[PDB]
Enzyme design. Sequence first.
Site, PDB file in Angstrom:
ATOM      1  N   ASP A  46      40.612   7.177  22.986  1.00 47.29           N
ATOM      2  CA  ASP A  46      39.257   7.278  22.422  1.00 47.29           C
ATOM      3  C   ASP A  46      39.257   6.591  21.053  1.00 47.29           C
ATOM      4  OD1 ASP A  46      36.515   8.922  22.494  1.00 47.29           O
ATOM      5  OD2 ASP A  46      37.377   8.975  20.446  1.00 47.29           O
ATOM      6  N   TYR A  51      35.710   3.356  13.258  1.00 53.38           N
ATOM      7  CA  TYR A  51      37.053   3.762  12.819  1.00 53.38           C
ATOM      8  C   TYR A  51      37.853   2.612  12.181  1.00 53.38           C
ATOM      9  CZ  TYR A  51      36.241   7.817  15.904  1.00 53.38           C
ATOM     10  OH  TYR A  51      35.641   8.871  16.596  1.00 53.38           O
ATOM     11  N   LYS A  80      32.720   3.308  20.901  1.00 56.44           N
ATOM     12  CA  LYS A  80      31.432   3.859  20.472  1.00 56.44           C
ATOM     13  C   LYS A  80      30.639   2.855  19.667  1.00 56.44           C
ATOM     14  CE  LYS A  80      33.796   8.339  19.984  1.00 56.44           C
ATOM     15  NZ  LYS A  80      35.111   7.988  19.462  1.00 56.44           N
ATOM     16  N   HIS A 113      27.355   6.748  19.057  1.00 57.99           N
ATOM     17  CA  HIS A 113      28.215   7.630  18.242  1.00 57.99           C
ATOM     18  C   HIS A 113      27.431   8.856  17.729  1.00 57.99           C
ATOM     19  CE1 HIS A 113      32.151   7.208  15.746  1.00 57.99           C
ATOM     20  NE2 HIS A 113      31.830   8.490  15.814  1.00 57.99           N
TER      21      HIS A 113
HETATM   22  N1  NAD Z   1      32.494  11.295  18.452  1.00 56.65           N
HETATM   23  C1  NAD Z   1      32.685  11.618  17.138  1.00 56.65           C
HETATM   24  O1  NAD Z   1      31.648  11.753  16.208  1.00 56.65           O
HETATM   25  C2  NAD Z   1      34.054  11.751  16.533  1.00 56.65           C
HETATM   26  C3  NAD Z   1      34.137  12.009  15.179  1.00 56.65           C
HETATM   27  C4  NAD Z   1      35.440  12.235  14.675  1.00 56.65           C
HETATM   28  C5  NAD Z   1      36.610  12.029  15.432  1.00 56.65           C
HETATM   29  N2  NAD Z   1      36.497  11.718  16.778  1.00 56.65           N
HETATM   30  C6  NAD Z   1      37.618  11.506  17.751  1.00 56.65           C
HETATM   31  O2  NAD Z   1      38.277  12.749  17.924  1.00 56.65           O
HETATM   32  C7  NAD Z   1      39.689  12.587  17.853  1.00 56.65           C
HETATM   33  C8  NAD Z   1      40.234  13.999  17.536  1.00 56.65           C
HETATM   34  O3  NAD Z   1      39.838  14.475  16.232  1.00 56.65           O
HETATM   35  P1  NAD Z   1      40.840  14.447  14.975  1.00 56.65           P
HETATM   36  O4  NAD Z   1      41.566  13.136  14.986  1.00 56.65           O
HETATM   37  O5  NAD Z   1      40.117  14.804  13.746  1.00 56.65           O
HETATM   38  O6  NAD Z   1      41.886  15.656  15.327  1.00 56.65           O
HETATM   39  P2  NAD Z   1      42.425  16.902  16.207  1.00 56.65           P
HETATM   40  O7  NAD Z   1      41.557  18.047  16.273  1.00 56.65           O
HETATM   41  O8  NAD Z   1      43.019  16.453  17.479  1.00 56.65           O
HETATM   42  O9  NAD Z   1      43.507  17.290  15.181  1.00 56.65           O
HETATM   43  C9  NAD Z   1      44.676  16.595  14.957  1.00 56.65           C
HETATM   44  C10 NAD Z   1      45.621  17.447  14.168  1.00 56.65           C
HETATM   45  O10 NAD Z   1      46.243  18.367  15.072  1.00 56.65           O
HETATM   46  C11 NAD Z   1      47.588  18.547  14.731  1.00 56.65           C
HETATM   47  N3  NAD Z   1      48.371  18.571  15.978  1.00 56.65           N
HETATM   48  C12 NAD Z   1      48.235  17.724  17.066  1.00 56.65           C
HETATM   49  N4  NAD Z   1      49.111  18.136  18.008  1.00 56.65           N
HETATM   50  C13 NAD Z   1      49.801  19.209  17.541  1.00 56.65           C
HETATM   51  C14 NAD Z   1      50.831  19.932  18.146  1.00 56.65           C
HETATM   52  N5  NAD Z   1      51.213  19.733  19.496  1.00 56.65           N
HETATM   53  N6  NAD Z   1      51.323  20.985  17.339  1.00 56.65           N
HETATM   54  C15 NAD Z   1      50.884  21.240  16.055  1.00 56.65           C
HETATM   55  N7  NAD Z   1      49.873  20.496  15.484  1.00 56.65           N
HETATM   56  C16 NAD Z   1      49.353  19.495  16.258  1.00 56.65           C
HETATM   57  C17 NAD Z   1      47.978  17.413  13.811  1.00 56.65           C
HETATM   58  O11 NAD Z   1      48.399  18.020  12.613  1.00 56.65           O
HETATM   59  C18 NAD Z   1      46.719  16.566  13.616  1.00 56.65           C
HETATM   60  O12 NAD Z   1      46.550  16.142  12.268  1.00 56.65           O
HETATM   61  C19 NAD Z   1      39.733  11.505  16.764  1.00 56.65           C
HETATM   62  O13 NAD Z   1      40.988  10.993  16.427  1.00 56.65           O
HETATM   63  C20 NAD Z   1      38.711  10.503  17.305  1.00 56.65           C
HETATM   64  O14 NAD Z   1      39.171   9.686  18.418  1.00 56.65           O
HETATM   65  C21 NAD Z   1      35.209  11.627  17.301  1.00 56.65           C
END
Ligand code: NAD
Length: 319
Positions: A46, A51, A80, A113
Amino acid sequence: QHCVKLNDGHLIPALGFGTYKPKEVPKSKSLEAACLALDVGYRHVDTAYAYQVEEEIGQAIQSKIKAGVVKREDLFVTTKLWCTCFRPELVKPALEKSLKKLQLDYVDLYIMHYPVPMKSGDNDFPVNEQGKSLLDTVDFCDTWERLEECKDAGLVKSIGVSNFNHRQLERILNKPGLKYKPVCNQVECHLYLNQRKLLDYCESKDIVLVAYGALGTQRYKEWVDQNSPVLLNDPVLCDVAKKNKRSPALIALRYLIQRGIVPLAQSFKENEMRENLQVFGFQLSPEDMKTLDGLNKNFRYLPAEFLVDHPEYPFVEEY
Ligand SMILES: NC(=O)c1ccc[n+]([C@@H]2O[C@H](COP(=O)([O-])OP(=O)(O)OC[C@H]3O[C@@H](n4cnc5c(N)ncnc54)[C@H](O)[C@@H]3O)[C@@H](O)[C@H]2O)c1
């Protein structure tokens, strides 16, 4: 592959890899992480125009295709359309730009988005001198019609939306002349914002909810209030995790999986990336699912406050 069926018959892998790049993180790190994710076994990637890393995602994919690690047909790539490109005449050129960055002939999924447009231009976050966002007025149904044209052109396999509320979805779905329904609504969703009402609505319309922030986000302070609760340190989550002999992250993902949601999970750490793929190897009992439903706080890590002064700001409505 553990996949979910979309309302156009296409299959989306049920866990995706996220690629948001924090302000201070170098593009090289995003590239490395995407390369590693492909080796580890992620197939759903994704990403987004806004980004700033589509080029890196494209490099990861082509280098791993050249090395024989994966084939294009094995991957599900989402990107997006950004708010500055919502005017209808800008939609297809923006997609074509992204395809060039990604080094792809098509993407599997292309989504709006947000429902709120912004002033067009090279700057992704246009502001006035006071720092107020310069928004725009463009009916999302007009933007949607161009996404439909992109699908008909074979540039994208499936089309959908992100950060829409149920009224906004209704407007698309009820529009006379609609060709194609959105296949998904990608929204923030996790144990503290479980989206039960929006989920039930989406199910009723055969729309898949794709969850970002599934693990509480990476807590990038450009967007996430540093005082927000740390989901992975929640005491109830950690107790359920201990009982089930899984990590808190795996419980938080499985929770969403069992509700028919397709979560995204981001990490830069190899062993975390590896662990998250284990989510199809265990199940949560109805009692533990009930316990986990009790964590909802209606708490948003990502309220997109820069979009608030607009009638299509999505998060005022109940759902
Ligand atoms: N459509 C939208 O408006 C929008 C906006 C923001 C982000 N996104 C998407 O969503 C994705 C997910 O959101 P995100 O990146 O903020 O994070 P997320 O909720 O997946 O959080 C990631 C965090 O989880 C922790 N983590 C991951 N695996 C772990 C494990 N097995 N054990 C312990 N900790 C663990 C890490 O510390 C990491 O920093 C983004 O990277 C992007 O592709 C979409």
